[PDB]
Each structure stands twice: as C-alpha cells, then as structure tokens.
Design a protein around this nucleic acid. Structure first.
Ligand SMILES: [Mg+2]
Ligand SMILES: [Mg+2]
Ligand SMILES: [Mg+2]
Ligand SMILES: [Mg+2]
Ligand SMILES: [Zn+2]
Lengths: 94, 76, 58, 116, 136
RNA sequence: GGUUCUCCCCGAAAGCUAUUUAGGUAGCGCCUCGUGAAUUCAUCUCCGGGGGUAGAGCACUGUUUCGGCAAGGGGGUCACUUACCAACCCGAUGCAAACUGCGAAUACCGGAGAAUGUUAUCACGGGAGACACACGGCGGGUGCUAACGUCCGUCGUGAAGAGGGAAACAACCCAGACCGCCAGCUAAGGUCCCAAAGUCAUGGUUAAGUGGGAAACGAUGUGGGAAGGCCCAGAC
RNA sequence: CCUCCUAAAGAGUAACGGAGGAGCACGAAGGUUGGCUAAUCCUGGUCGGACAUCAGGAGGUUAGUGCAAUGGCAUAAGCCA
RNA sequence: GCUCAACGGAUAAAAGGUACUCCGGGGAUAACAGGCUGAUACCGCCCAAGAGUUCAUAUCGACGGCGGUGUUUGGCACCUC
RNA sequence: UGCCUGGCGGCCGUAGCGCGGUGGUCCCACCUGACCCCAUGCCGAACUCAGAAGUGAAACGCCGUAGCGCCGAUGGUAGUGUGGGGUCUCCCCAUGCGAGAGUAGGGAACUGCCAGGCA
C-alpha cells in the first residue's frame, strides 16, 4: 500500500553517502531472493513521515524505481545517534 | 602504594618478517611462550626463542586442529 | 609511456618529510617548475600524495 | 574413552617423526588381526603394506593374531621392504607398549635385516 | 551513590571522550532521555538527576539507568606541589557521547514524561532531548 | 666576564647511555673534511609480511541494571508449604590504560620495477660543537579534558630566516633574501578612506552596529523546510 | 634487578605515573624412558559431617605449573614410576 | 673473601654547626611584586522540592547546572639576585 | 570401476555437538579365558597374553534432521592516512582504504595413498 519513489545510486562508499545526507537524502539497499542487491537512494523527509506509523514496519512495502514496482519488506533500520533522522534501511524482497 | 619501579624492556618481537631470506642460525622471533610454534626447519630454543636451521625464506603458516600459528622455512 | 606535465603550486617549507621526499622524486624544486613526466601508476601515486599542491596537465 | 586415549598417547611419537622427515612403520593391533604399514614422510601415502587379513599369510597361521602371527607378518612386511629397499625405516609403536605383538613384529623385522 | 563496589585497580588514566555513542534505542521501556552534547557525568550528577525526576513520577512505573561510571577521577589538593605521585580518588565519572540514552521511564503518560525529563535536564551539564521507543 | 680584519662553500644540537652526576664530562646519534664502497639510500606502485591501537563487542578477566527459573536457609507445619531472603544458570543491556571469542587507517620490515635527486647511504680517518630547548598542530601521562604548567611520541617553525599577512606580536599562515633595475605575473591576505586595489555583478540574510569577546538557559524577532486540526451546512 | 600498563596495532619511548615481586629454591623439583588427565557440579551411600576415601554421569583445562606478573603449556612444559 | 644496597662499584678507614661568616655564580632555583591560570574564594544566573498560616519565585532556597571578576588561599617559576 | 571397512595423511568447526534411523559375511568394537610373557602407584578397567562361545548394545562408521556452535556477504555506520576548515575538551569537508556487531544466506565437510570384503 505504501508507495516510495526511489532512484538508483551512481556511486558507493561513505563519500557519496555523506553527500546525500547533506542534500536531504539517505542511501538504502534492496536484497533478498535470487536477484542481485540494488543500491537505492531515498528522500529523507518523505520516509521520515511514513516511518512514524507502525504499519511502515509490518506491512508489505512497494517501491517505484526506474519504472518498476518491487514488493519488499522493512528488515532493519539504522538511525542517527542523537538527531531524529535516518541513516540506512534494509529491504528484503517479499 | 609506594609505586614507581619499571624494569629494562626486553627487546622482544619479530626480528625476521616473512619473505626475508635468512641464514642458518639466525633468530626470527624472540618470545616468552609459544606465541609462535616451531615448524619446518625451525628449532625452538631454551627460552622458547625460534631460530633458523636452514638457509631460506621465512614462511608463516597457521596449521593444526587447534588453529595455532607456525613458522616454516622454505628453500630459496 | 605518454608524456604529462607536473607543475608545483605551493611551497615545500611546512611539508612532512614524506612530502619533501615526494617532490624530490618528482624533480620539483620551486613554485612554477614545469617538468615532463610519464603517466605510470608509480608516478601517478606520487601525484596522489601531493595533489593538494601540484598542477597536472594531461 | 578407549580409542581416543590411544591416539593422544601416540601423537607425541607421531609428530616427532614428522619433524625428522623419516619413514615410519606404524602398527595397528586387534584381538583378531594385526597391521603394519611403511609410510612415506609426507604421511599421505604408503609404500609397503602387509597384514594378516590377507589370505597369503593366514594360511600358515593357527590363529590370526598372536606372538607367532606377529613374527610371521613382521617378517612379511620386512621381506616386502627389502624388495623395495626403503632401508632404515623408523618404527612407530602407535600408542601400544613394546612388550607383546608390537615387540614381536619389530624383532622379526630386525631379523630380516632392516635398520631400526 | 553509583560507584563500583570493587575494582581490579584503584586508579585510572584521564582518557578522552571521542567517538559516537552505542546506547541508541530504548530497549527497556517506552520513553527515554537521550543526551545531545558531549561531556562527563559525575556520580553526584547521576544521583541528583535520579532524585529530581522521582519526586514527580510517584511510586508507580519503573525507571532504568542505562549508564554506569566505571571511571575514577583523582584530584591534587591545595598547597601541594606537582609530582609526588598521582592524587587520591575523589569521584567517579562516565564518558558520555552524543546519542547516548541516559534515563528511561515506563508506565507513565507522555505529558508526565515531558515534565520530569525537563526537570532532570537542568541538573545534567550537557544538552539532552526527548525520545520515544521505535520498534525494530 | 671578554676575545679584535675580510670573502666564499657546507652546516648542527639541546637526544640516548652512564656518572657523589644533574648548569660538568665521556661514548654514540647529529656537523664538517678526506679516502673507499656496492646502483647503497629516499619517494611511489605491486608482491611477501607481522599486528591488536582507533573502533567495536561482552566468549574470557573485572564490573553493572532488569526479568524469568530456582537449589538452599528462615518461618508455618502432627511428609508438605508461606505475603520471606537468595547463589548458580537463562534472556535483554552497558562500561574498562593494565578485558579481546573480533578488527583498521597508515606507520614499519623485506623483495621487484620505472622515474627523480650534485651519494642524499654505509664503512673508516682528522677536528668539533651540543647533552638548559621553546611554542603550534596531533596522539597521550600528570594537572581542574586550568596554565605562555609539566613529562613523552610525532611533525612544523623558531633557535640558526629576513620579507608579505594576522593593527603591533621569535614559535601561527604564506614564502627560505647571490647582487643591481622607478618591469611584469601571482601566493597567503585584501579592493569606501588612512593605505595599493570593485563604493563590482547576481541570489539571500541581519536592523542588532550583530558583525566588532563570552555559556547554560529564556522569548508571538525574522528567513527557510516538512507534516496536521477547522472552514463557503460560513470557520478563526 | 624482574612483570604488566602508560607505549599512540614493529622495536625503542619519560615523570616523585599506575599495580606487584626478587638478593632464591632444587641432586630431583634435573636428564631420559614408560604411563597418567584435572577445576566445578548432580546423584548414591556403616562410621561421615562442610571435606576426608569412591562409583558412574555432566563438564573438557576455567585445574595445574617451588613464587611476582605476563606470555605459554593436551604431543602436555601438568602428574607418577 | 665485598648489603662496594649510593648496587657501571671517588678511601683499607669518615658524623655535625655557622645568625661571626666568606667567595664564585644564578631569575637556570625560593621569599616581596607583576604576569599566566581560575581549583578555591567572591559575585551573578538556570531548574524548583521545601520554608513562607494556605500559596515555589514578597522575602528565601536543597539536591544539581552554566558563567563573570582576577578578589582570598593557591598552582606555575615567565620578568628581576 | 561401484558399495562397505581399516590404517596413515592433507585440511583444521561450511570438518563440532545434540536428536532420529541403520550396519555385522569381511572389518572394527565390546566380549571369552588368564597359572603364565607382563601389567596395576589397589584393580586383566587400562596395560598385555591365549582364544572366537556371543553380539551390533556402549563406542565407532554411514545416512537423515537447522536445537546449538560455526562460516558469512551486499549496503550502511564507527575509525583513519594526506590536505583543508569550524562553535577547536571536539567535529566537519575533499580524496584514499575500509571495520566490528547484526541481517539475507551458506552449512550435517572435502580430498590423497594403500589394504580387506561384497557385486
Ligand atoms: Mg572524509
Ligand atoms: Mg580385555
Ligand atoms: Mg548401536
Ligand atoms: Mg562484518
Ligand atoms: Zn517573593
């Protein structure tokens, strides 16, 4: 039911990761199944409002990226240490 | 309580690293216990000092079922 | 290899001894010394160490 | 345990011959039979093997394992060793005492002319 | 007063307060008090801030302390020259990093949690903020 | 305490060890000069290495919070139990220079290779000086995560370097002065005057002279961003 | 004079920095050969309990090593002849 | 055969006073003072259980927290022997 | 060449433990007997001798099972060399290298010589 707009990452490492967090973004990943893992960048303010409800961690998540709807599930979330922000969210294809 | 003593620091550690060609009789690693174990062409001294018994290069291996470290010498 | 050019930008006074030895291996002596070098990864690794203070022209 | 106490007893004598690079003669003792193998110093291959479960030896024996059988198979390994010529093998007692069939298999091979 | 009952050695070096915290999420209750700034919490500060909230959250619910000092600080007294060995142990401190959950509380309303954690933030020498338990 | 003419080239150290030694002196490192020596040494790339520090974790060595299960002990009993205290074990959660079931960055050691450098390297010989170091960045011990405080490691400058900038200000930043010229381009740093250069262009902020010293904490100051409640059955 | 940490993942590295310990013991506690495997806990039980000694089971070096501490030790460097 | 233990060990053999003092120095090292620093001291502020008949802030203020002045006791030995 | 078993290895937990099932012609294991060769710091348990009545129990070998141990990414985080900067007890930016823990998942080993049995 939850639809999240996403884009594929063009770089990797903590260098590109800190540049996204200074530009109202945060990286993520989508893994699981027989498919290869895909590097995913996400808008920070959009996910932060959605994660406040308990249905964001229980129900099946839908992600529209590159003209493709992949049904996933939230597996693990990394949060900022002291600010109420997000760092990295794990996704399992289910 | 009445502290302030320290001994002379004994010059331990690895003296001949891996890949180095050593002579027969040279000291590879000075040590107290068997941090390193004797292997191929390597003799163990009285104070557990591992020395060379043949001319060749130093080769470090981790063998045995107890996952212990060894020193071997391959022929150059 | 093909020829590139390395020109020193800043001085070598406040540098580390590794950065001073890097400029001696690159043959740089003063600011504005333009000299030709080859584009091997050994020379390119010397450029990567002092990239804050050299100018390179491919 | 019965078997594992035999293995840890021999282990000091096993790895000592590994440090010298010599060819060892191990023995396996059984209430039924007895074994003896000449092993290369790498330890992953043998060169001379002759036992009492082979029918060539058991025909001349009243019972498959005793002091008379260890004298027979001790010679039998030693005669096959002289045909190969390993010539100063080492003796591995393999966790047993040097009193009975282990001694009988060794002294029989000493009589044939092997250097141990 | 929160202090170790027995240590292997009496004294300890000064150390530093570098790095990030590891006490990120509340894992005992539903409400927490997370440190924002950087510094040290002495033994008196942890004891006083526990007394500061407990007055207003009367005897129901449950309060956890997620930290423990485990670090002594020695002092050299007045009119004493430098040297003569290290001084005597006076008080215990805790190395606190930005992001450490310090004080937790469960079984209280959310409006009551905002009051008591505000009353305990003044006793702490570093800035704090209010957090709430997020699942997973 | 003082040591008197000139010019050129190179150029320290304030460390270790030992000392009735601690402001002294000796050896060594470092300086100069001379002979001799291997392609020696330095830098980077790849290869061969050893790590247990930063971090992280709580299997171990210590510590600490909660819950569950509970031998035992106390009490009640005409063999059991109670509103009692509680080890070990199990789950969850921390902390530690003298904890490590884990683990870097680089640094260091060795080998090969190109480029570069006036042998920058080692051996030996002649002559030393020095062994009071300072501050700054970083890693620490100590001290109050006070000191233009002290003691180390490492790097830089000063010492032994002027010049430009930080108003002035050895140690900060830029930059190592062969000499002359009323040439130009620039570095850090600046462009309204003192005082050389934009009263430059564009998009904003601030109205306090903030800028142009200073914290916890307090406030319908204002700019920017996201999420809600109510309302053309007339909302505030 | 010795051990650990300070010591910043080689060595080296200070202070009236943090914790201890040594001026020996030993003819076996040495050498060699042959053997042997603890700590803790459960259950059982003439004297017998908290322990005297055992049996099996759980457990697999947390035991031990003439002593300070670290690094070692099962092939035992531990233990016995 | 040396606790030459001050242990790289000035003699086989060694305790004190000097305010009657003296010389050679030193701000390389103290006392007066400056300066650095602000633990302490002084002063101010934040949170507000409690005192104030009831009632925190009229007057006060615990447990704790953040600064200012350089003002006491100091710390340091940077100027001066 | 297959199946099964023994010996010595390579390797050192993706090779272990627990649970479930199974193997006796050969093999191995227990077992039988022991005055004796010898052995016990007491003891035929071990050691060791002489035998084969009995048996797949204990142990061992194999198969099956993901309760546990273990192996273990991708991405992200912590840290850091060099350079630069800030509100400089600390942290950020440029670039280089990349954790630990945890997750997805992998996993009931693999392999060499030789001997015996069966087909
Ligand atoms: Mg970076
Ligand atoms: Mg028997
Ligand atoms: Mg069975
Ligand atoms: Mg990992
Ligand atoms: Zn009032």
């Amino acid at each position: 039911m939850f639809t999240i707009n996403a884009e594929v990452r063009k770089e990797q490492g903590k260098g590109a990761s800190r540049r996204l967090r200074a530009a109202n973004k945060f990286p993520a990943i989508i893994y699981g199944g027989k498919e290869a893992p895909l590097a995913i960048e996400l808008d920070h303010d959009k996910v932060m409002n959605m994660q406040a409800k308990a249905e964001f961690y229980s129900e099946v998540l839908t992600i529209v990226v590159d003209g493709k709807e992949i049904k996933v599930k939230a597996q693990d979330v990394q949060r900022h240490p002291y600010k109420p922000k997000l760092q990295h969210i794990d996704f399992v294809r289910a | 309580t009445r502290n302030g003593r320290d001994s002379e620091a004994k010059r331990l550690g690895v003296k001949r690293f891996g890949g180095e060609s050593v002579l027969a009789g040279s000291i590879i690693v000075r040590q107290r216990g068997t941090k390193f174990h004797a292997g191929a062409n390597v003799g163990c001294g009285r104070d557990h000092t591992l020395f060379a018994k043949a001319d060749g290069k130093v080769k470090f291996e981790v063998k045995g079922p107890k996952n212990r470290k060894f020193i071997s010498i391959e022929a150059e | 290899a093909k020829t590139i050019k390395i020109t020193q930008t800043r001085s070598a006074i406040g540098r580390l001894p590794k950065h001073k030895a890097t400029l001696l291996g690159l043959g740089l002596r003063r600011i504005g010394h333009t000299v030709e070098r080859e584009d091997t990864p050994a020379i390119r690794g010397m450029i990567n160490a002092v990239s804050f203070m050299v100018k390179v022209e491919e | 345990d019965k078997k594992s106490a035999r293995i840890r007893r021999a282990t000091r004598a096993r790895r000592k011959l590994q440090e010298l690079g010599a060819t060892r003669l191990v023995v396996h003792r059984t209430p039924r039979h007895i074994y003896a193998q000449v092993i290369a110093p790498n330890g992953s291959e043998v060169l001379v093997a002759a036992s009492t479960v082979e029918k060539a030896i058991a025909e001349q024996l009243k019972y498959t394992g005793n002091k008379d059988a260890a004298a027979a198979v001790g010679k039998a390994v030693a005669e096959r060793a002289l045909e190969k010529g390993i010539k100063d093998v080492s003796f591995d007692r393999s966790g047993f005492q040097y009193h009975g069939r282990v001694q009988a298999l060794a002294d029989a091979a000493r009589e044939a002319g092997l250097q141990f | 007063m929160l202090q170790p009952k027995r240590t292997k050695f009496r004294k300890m070096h000064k150390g530093r307060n570098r790095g990030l915290a590891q006490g990120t999420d509340v894992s005992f209750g539903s409400f927490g008090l997370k440190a924002v700034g950087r510094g040290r919490l002495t033994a008196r500060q942890i004891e006083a801030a526990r007394r500061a909230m407990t007055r207003a959250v009367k005897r129901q619910g449950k309060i956890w302390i997620r930290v423990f000092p485990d670090k002594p600080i020695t002092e050299k007294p007045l009119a004493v020259r430098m040297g003569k060995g290290k001084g005597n142990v006076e008080y215990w401190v805790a190395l606190i990093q930005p992001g450490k959950v310090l004080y937790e509380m469960d079984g209280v309303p959310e409006e009551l949690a905002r009051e008591a954690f505000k009353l305990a933030a003044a006793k702490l020498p570093i800035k704090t903020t209010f957090v709430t338990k997020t699942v997973m």
